[PDB]
Amino acid sequence: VPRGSHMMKAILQLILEKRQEFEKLPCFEFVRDETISPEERLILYPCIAAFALNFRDLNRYDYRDDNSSDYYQKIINIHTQEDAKHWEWFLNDLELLGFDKTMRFSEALRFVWSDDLLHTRRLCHNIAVLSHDLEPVMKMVVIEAMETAGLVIFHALAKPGESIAKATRRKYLYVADSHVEVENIITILEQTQLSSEQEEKAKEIVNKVFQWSTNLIGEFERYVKAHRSEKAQPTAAY
Ligand SMILES: N[C@@H](Cc1c[nH]c2c(Br)cc(Br)cc12)C(=O)O
């Protein structure tokens, strides 16, 4: 009924429209293609190395503010305690997939900072820069947009992930349903109102978040096309 609640609902509906467009990217059709072996489809998994530990830091140090009495910021802090745990899931599955290979320190560094992973590596950086001077209600819009994009990615990746978990009888934690199925942010947002200026800013936020996620998926697609002869090697980690 109140005008402030209609504006919030418009932003939450905008997130759904971006999600619908985001799900149609060709990278997700490849990852979901059951006719290609799941090891081949997960060749892009090491690309996430340029993201996952930065996402841990985004939650520990950029989103979180332990010295805050604000009601919304304390909800955000609770959310960050969950998401800051997931980098260990990424490293768990990196080893299970046979991608935790021995190499020179400089090869690991040149991989993470590769120009082919520029958008992947800078996603959390751009989010932190965008979020720094945001009031907590706008930070929540950032987090909700980010969580929606992320669920699209891991619903897709959980398909070849759970196929390998079943075919090898090993417990996957990151490309796995348990990660997908993890007072939520969306529940608080639906009860909260936005001012007129906040609705304009929230549109800019949602547009930027899904643009940077789309750039990241674009890099994943180019990476697959450059590594068609390679695949995960789960047997190397037995
Ligand atoms: N659930 C993921 C977080 C996440 C959220 N958004 C993401 C995007 Br957009 C791309 C990638 Br790769 C990962 C994410 C995690 O916990 O590490």
Residue numbers in the entry: -6 to 175, 184 to 239
Source paper text:
Here we report a third nitrile biosynthesis strategy featuring the cyanobacterial nitrile synthase AetD.
However, we were able to obtain a substrate-bound co-crystal structure of AetD at 2.08 Å resolution, which displays an excellent omit map density for 5,7-dibromo-l-tryptophan in the absence of iron. Thus, the three ligands that exclusively coordinate Fe1 (the amino acid moiety of substrate, H79 and H172) are all positioned for Fe1 binding when the substrate is present. Diiron bridging residue E176, and Fe2 ligand H179, on the other hand, are part of a highly flexible region of core helix α3 (E176 to T183) and are disordered. Of the residues that bind Fe2 (D76, E140, E176 and H179), only D76 of core helix α1 has good omit electron density. Substrate binding therefore seems to pre-organize AetD to bind Fe1 but not Fe2. In AetD, the substrate binding pocket is more accessible in the apo state when side chains are not positioned for metal binding and core α3 is unwound.
